[PDB]
């Protein structure tokens with residue numbers, strides 16, 4: 001039936017700025033919030049302001065030296081940290097910006113707070129659109145990500161859950177999360193992503209885990225132009241098989257919106273309905289679920305996507321006509337919620353999709 005949804009948001013999140021020209025725009029989190037408020041979706045959710053996660057909470061995964069660096073570095077003292085910036089991959093993709101550490105604290109605080117709420121059985125779903133920063137590593141920033149809020153939230157869920165399933169629908173491979181749990185069977189990581197001449201370069205079909213983690217990492221490599229029809233016919237069968245074999249007791253779903261048609265950095269062709277069908281499929285299993293953000297670089301479409309996915313979490317139907325809102329002009333020329341796919345060629349032939357699905361099913365047969 002209908003579930004209790006807790007949503008985490010800090011009104012300051014939209015003010016963090018990665019710098020002129022940088023595609024990562026935290027303002028998209030504020031556009032999402034404002035749109036979902038104007039649709040009246042606040043009447044049905046418990047809205048919480050995340051605490052600022054401490055350096056200590058972050059060191060449950062990250063190294064002490066890396067977190068000390070993130071808490072110390074600022075644009076005014078950068079010149080004194082040239083050595084550490086190289087060591088921790090702070091540069092063009094992961095710049096130093098005013099309030100960087102506070103941004104990490106809010107992104108992380110929402111994911112960890114959501115995981116605690118799920119552990120206490122005080123909610124069915126917890127949503128943190130400011131989270132999902134899946135590339136961050138133990139001692140290195142990567143791909144616009146500094147602190148891996150996902151890994152920290154999963155470690156929190158592991159306090160009460162024997163098996164946690166992580167699903168990632170961002171266009172980029174979820175490498176930081178896969179690496180963190182690569183040698184354990186207590187987390188199964190499943191990533192659907194563009195593979196081939198594309199960041200971060202990992203996530204081959206043949207990367208299946210190591211040691212006790214062998215068969216607990218699943219990668220579905222895709223080519224440009226995947227559409228709703230194609231994605232939908234592999235997502236539900238793969239997730240249904242993973243559910244059957246792995247029997248997780250909690251799920252974390254990274255909802256990166258850069259897999260939508262028209263994304264500034266992505267090359268896929270999903271609509272908001274096609275992307276949200278993944279949330280519908282996962283929600284159907286009736287397991288404690290943490291829904292997180294991630295990529296998404298055409299910000300009007302990110303706000304549409306995450307607003308519609310919050311309505312899906314709530315089992316609330318919302319009209320296609322957008323309500324007036326603080327960013328109404330960003331949604332022209334149509335002012336509608338749903339988007340149309342482009343005419344781009346889908347390079348993922350139906351035979352390729354079936355063949356990769358079959359190779360993943362062979363690996364899933366290897367689970368106990």
Ligand SMILES: CCN1CCC2(CC1)C[C@@H]2C(=O)N[C@@H](CCCCCC(O)(O)CC)c1ncc(-c2cc3ccccc3nc2OC)[nH]1
Nearest residue numbers: 021022023092093133134143144170172199258294295296
């Ligand atoms: C130009 C910097 N250069 C660095 C070296 C490089 C090439 C790009 C090898 C690495 C790379 O390909 N990085 C990826 C990370 C992608 C991370 C996705 C994150 C998520 O999964 O969605 C989770 C949240 C990359 N692609 C696009 C950019 C990019 C960075 C910029 C920074 C400042 C200004 C403009 C910029 N414009 C950009 O695009 C137009 N970066």
Ligand SMILES: [Ca+2]
Nearest residue numbers: 168170192193
């Ligand atoms: Ca992915």
Ligand SMILES: [Ca+2]
Nearest residue numbers: 181187213216
């Ligand atoms: Ca694993």
Ligand SMILES: [Zn+2]
Nearest residue numbers: 170172258295
């Ligand atoms: Zn991405």
